[PDB]
Design a binder for this molecule. Structure first.
Ligand SMILES: [Cl-]
Ligand SMILES: [Zn+2]
Lengths: 108, 151, 151, 151, 110, 110
């Protein structure tokens, strides 16, 4: 493929001299926007306590999700955490454990 | 005047992890300077392309009490990102720590420092992003961000 | 062209302490480069003698389970060695952390960074060694090894 | 020879926090050197004014026993100060860590490293100060202090 | 207004050119000695858990003290620590908590 | 005394000029291989929780071993570890605390 206006389509990157658009390699690297990258970005590899929700394509990075019973949240993006198994004394559960949240307990 | 380096500090104040620190500023009274780089929306903007040793120290400090309806484990993470001529920020470095798990913990002091050499193009932007921004101590000697050309 | 520096990383897949990390690699889809130095058996080989600020970050990361009939205390150590015109490796820097001792600990996040200046002769080799290699997270932004001519 | 850098190490031995480490020394056997800077009363003395990347690694290491009638929480802190043409020392950098709070803790390994760029005048003096000096392990590969002209 | 011998008096700092002594901003910064600094030192800020024993003035930096129930010592200048509420078994409290020390516990005989 | 083939023998280092082999200082430093080192390597000092199995000689680095009741291993070369003083319920001592291992406890087999 040929670089359009100095950029290459998602799923590729431009060569050193800038004459050709080289395809990223599926399963290893990707790019999601028209770019000038000399390298494609590397696919995330989900860790041990996560499951791959959708594999890495030359255009979209892998999507990882915490394993059942554990969750990840904005201030805790490094490691899946264990959900509480039940609500504190005399409180009610209004929200279940999901890979993006702990259980939610409220008051009377 | 041909020296390319910067060391900025602060005072207490969209596709990247954590929250970007934008309260950095240039002022001699806080031991911070800019030499052939400038600050913009908390981002160090590059002027000369080259190899840059980039670093940052973020001081996590808290006087904790085991709260009620929540877990207390904390993941203190510092991220150093770059904005290049690509829509999304690209992560250069990350460094993490977990808080002490003991129920006997009364407080936490966790200074995190990291650094590394990266090739940056003219107009590239670098920034620091952290989880738990509310626990960051911004005293200029405890938290800072900087870089220098390393050829 | 005349710049002497290097920043190498790996990928989330003998008379020295711990175990040598030899999975580092050349290429920048993961932000690593070699400039007047090269890589051989996981060792950075020096071409020009001089003062080198050498550094390394190694991310110890684990989601442990309290094992019963055994001790669980972990000693996470990063060693930076050099091979010179001497048969045995010579230690330059070491940095250590103990894991949290609480029985309530569910996981550990221990990023270890260290660096320093050392004079290196041509053909000297430098490498990183760690205890508990199985807990190292090799994401390029988390674990890396570098050096640059300071002077 | 026109290189301005220093890396000093040791061996075990007012207006600043903690206590000043003064057992540093220049010797090739401990991988330490001085180049256009000198050592005096444990302080590195600047010859050429400019921007200096200053750094220090201080190894806190103890095999503690929960001492009965005593709180056991430890605040391990490393201070990097400068003496300039002002009576009182001026703090440049500070890095801290708290010991694990668990009653099951049998020992602690806390290597602290920090560094940053600061403009220094001719005849400025820089030094390292630390709390709990009696827990510092002065092995040359573990604890050091250095700096180099970065512009 | 004027720099004596290349130095400005406490509560001030010198100007870039070195012809003027600029006052430090009360409550913001200070300087306790004759100096040639291009800036006044930033006042320390007591963290909650500490009471401001005395304010930062143009010539004196603020003095902080640990809050009632907590203390501080030479090796713990970073965080006030909680005073123990009781003593170990076989020991009785004979001294109270202060901003500089934990309770005192001796052994009991009787 | 003499550099054979550009090198000095164990227990020595070569001089600046390269014409002489200088002896390492016993108890202070050493060299175990033929070498062209400008100085001998420093003898290791055993920690407070260790004993000197073997002294440092001009040709052999000191040997340190954990004190009784503690041990070290490949993944814990930094600090000697306290051996567990007893087995868990339903288990029994099968192996003792050695300088390189904790005690071994196996279940109660009826
Ligand atoms: Cl801990
Ligand atoms: Zn802990």
């Amino acid at each position: 493929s040929s670089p359009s206006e100095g950029l290459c389509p998602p799923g590729h990157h431009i060569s050193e001299d800038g004459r050709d658009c080289i395809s990223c390699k599926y399963g290893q690297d990707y790019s999601t926007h028209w770019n000038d990258l000399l390298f494609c970005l590397r696919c995330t590899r989900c860790d041990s306590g996560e499951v791959e929700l959708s594999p890495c394509t030359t255009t979209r990075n892998t999507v990882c999700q915490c394993e059942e019973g554990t969750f990840r949240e904005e201030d805790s993006p490094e490691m899946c955490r264990k959900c509480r198994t039940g609500c504190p004394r005399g409180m009610v559960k209004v929200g279940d454990c999901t890979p993006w949240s702990d259980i939610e307990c409220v008051h009377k | 005047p041909q020296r390319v380096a910067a060391h900025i500090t602060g005072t207490r104040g969209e596709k990247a992890l954590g929250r970007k620190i934008n309260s950095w500023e240039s002022s001699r009274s806080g031991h911070s300077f800019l030499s052939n780089l400038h600050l913009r929306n908390g981002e160090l903007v590059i002027h000369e392309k080259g190899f840059y040793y980039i670093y940052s120290q973020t001081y996590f400090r808290f006087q904790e009490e085991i709260k009620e309806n929540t877990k207390n484990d904390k993941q203190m993470v510092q991220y150093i990102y770059k904005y290049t001529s690509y829509p999304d920020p690209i992560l250069l470095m990350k460094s993490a720590r977990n808080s002490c798990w003991s129920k006997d913990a009364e407080y936490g002091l966790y200074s995190i420092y990291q650094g590394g050499i990266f090739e940056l193009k003219e107009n590239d932007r670098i920034f620091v992003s952290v989880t738990n921004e509310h626990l960051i101590d911004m005293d200029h000697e405890a938290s800072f961000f900087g870089a220098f050309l390393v050829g």
